[PDB]
Design a protein around this ligand. Structure first.
Ligand SMILES: Nc1ncnc2c1ncn2[C@@H]1O[C@H](COP(=O)(O)OP(=O)(O)OP(=O)(O)O)[C@@H](O)[C@H]1O
Ligand SMILES: [Cl-]
Ligand SMILES: [Cl-]
Ligand SMILES: [K+]
Ligand SMILES: [K+]
Ligand SMILES: [K+]
Ligand SMILES: [Mg+2]
Length: 378
């Protein structure tokens, strides 16, 4: 190709390419190494990635996200029915199949989950092409380890629709292990634990690797736990603060809440490197500027229960894998949320000081491994 590795996530997507014995995680037009998994439809255009997310506040009904939560599923699915209740966009039934319904250029249109994902995949393909200066065709696409045949098929289809020849569909935890070279033959089998805390989901996977062959020993987690939940906690904290300081409730102003949310997410990232962060929003509500700050300690307390809760799925995974903590040879951090110091502390303490594999940007690890695997399969 070269062939590329693509990681489609609920909040962000990432693409990498293995060249000259080195994986390059490709930055997009905005210089971002991961692209928001958003698609938007307006009176005049279809927006994808950064352009789409950067307007979600003003176009909630026609800005689609979470397509992978529907991909390969039936409309009658309990999870699909549950999820629909929280989405600002419409999901309709088409002969037992879910389709997202939106308005584009004044007309009603509907798309199968794979079509929405193909739009994001197309963006990742173009990002790779802009970088490589050559057409990208072959690719390795990743999916959560628990995805079934239908979900894998629909994910492959999204790739094909995007003009990609999907060389293989591989598990996200496996891709992460590959990124760290944990697939190399070392004689005996090894037990690896993947701790993936993304934007919308939390996955714990225990793999047993031997002779370059992976076995998913167990999987655990929470499909509704991620960085967005941490943002929500901060948002509520600041809504209350604004109310105290201005006796005005901004909760019903969907846009004001979004500008705050974005400020919070940004502040959250800053808190992973520094112990404090400043939030400055000009004319947040009724021309009132909102300048404030939050400490890492405060951020940790606001999310204490959620953070500590990540250890339960870890224990369950070990239990289902029939292994003790001591039997885990490697712990791999995946997902942007694993950059939070308190999360790393919790996991390391649980593992009695065992070092964590965290040198590869957690939100890029899956794409990294997929790129290596794509090169191998090419
Ligand atoms: N430095 C950081 N500190 C804390 N959180 C961070 C940091 N960088 C990114 N994040 C958070 O990581 C999340 C994105 O992670 P990632 O790109 O792994 O998600 P994803 O693959 O889309 O999620 P999922 O696999 O759950 O669908 C966002 O919630 C983002 O706020
Ligand atoms: Cl871009
Ligand atoms: Cl602690
Ligand atoms: K991702
Ligand atoms: K995840
Ligand atoms: K997941
Ligand atoms: Mg992910």
């Amino acid at each position: 190709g070269p062939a590329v590795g693509i990681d489609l996530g609920t909040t962000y997507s990432c693409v990498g390419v293995f060249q000259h014995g080195k994986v390059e995680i490709i930055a997009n037009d905005q210089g971002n190494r991961t692209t928001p998994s958003y698609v938007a439809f307006t009176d005049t255009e279809r927006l994808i990635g950064d352009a789409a997310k950067n307007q979600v506040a003003m176009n909630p009904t026609n800005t689609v996200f979470d397509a992978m939560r529907l991909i390969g599923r039936r409309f009658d699915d309990a999870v699909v029915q549950s999820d629909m209740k929280h989405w600002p966009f419409m999901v309709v039934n088409d002969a037992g199949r879910p389709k997202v319904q939106v308005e584009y250029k004044g007309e009603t249109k509907s798309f199968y989950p794979e079509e929405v994902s193909s739009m994001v995949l197309t963006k990742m393909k173009e990002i790779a092409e802009a970088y490589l200066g050559k057409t990208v065709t072959n690719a390795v696409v990743t999916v959560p380890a628990y995805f079934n045949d239908s979900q894998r098929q629909a994910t492959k289809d999204a790739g094909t629709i995007a003009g990609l020849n999907v060389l293989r569909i591989i598990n996200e935890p496996t891709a992460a292990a590959i990124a760290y070279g944990l697939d190399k033959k070392v004689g005996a089998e090894r037990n690896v634990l993947i701790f993936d805390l993304g934007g919308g989901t939390f996955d714990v996977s225990i793999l047993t690797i031997e002779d370059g062959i992976f076995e998913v020993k167990s999987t655990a987690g929470d499909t509704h736990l991620g960085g967005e939940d941490f943002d929500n906690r901060m948002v509520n904290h600041f809504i209350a603060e604004f109310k105290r300081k201005h006796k005005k409730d901004i909760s019903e102003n969907k846009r004001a809440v979004r500008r705050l949310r974005t400020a919070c997410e940004r502040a959250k990232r800053t808190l992973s490197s520094s112990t404090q962060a400043s939030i400055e929003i000009d004319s947040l509500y009724e021309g009132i500027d909102f300048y404030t700050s939050i400490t890492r300690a405060r951020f940790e307390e606001l999310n204490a229960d959620l953070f500590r809760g990540t250890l339960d799925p870890v224990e369950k995974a070990l239990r289902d894998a029939k292994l003790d903590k001591s039997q885990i040879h490697d712990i791999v951090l995946v997902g942007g949320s694993t950059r939070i110091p308190k999360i790393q502390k919790l996991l390391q303490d649980f593992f009695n000081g065992k070092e964590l594999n965290k040198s590869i940007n957690p939100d890029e690890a899956v794409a990294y491994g997929a790129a290596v695997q794509a090169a191998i399969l090419s």
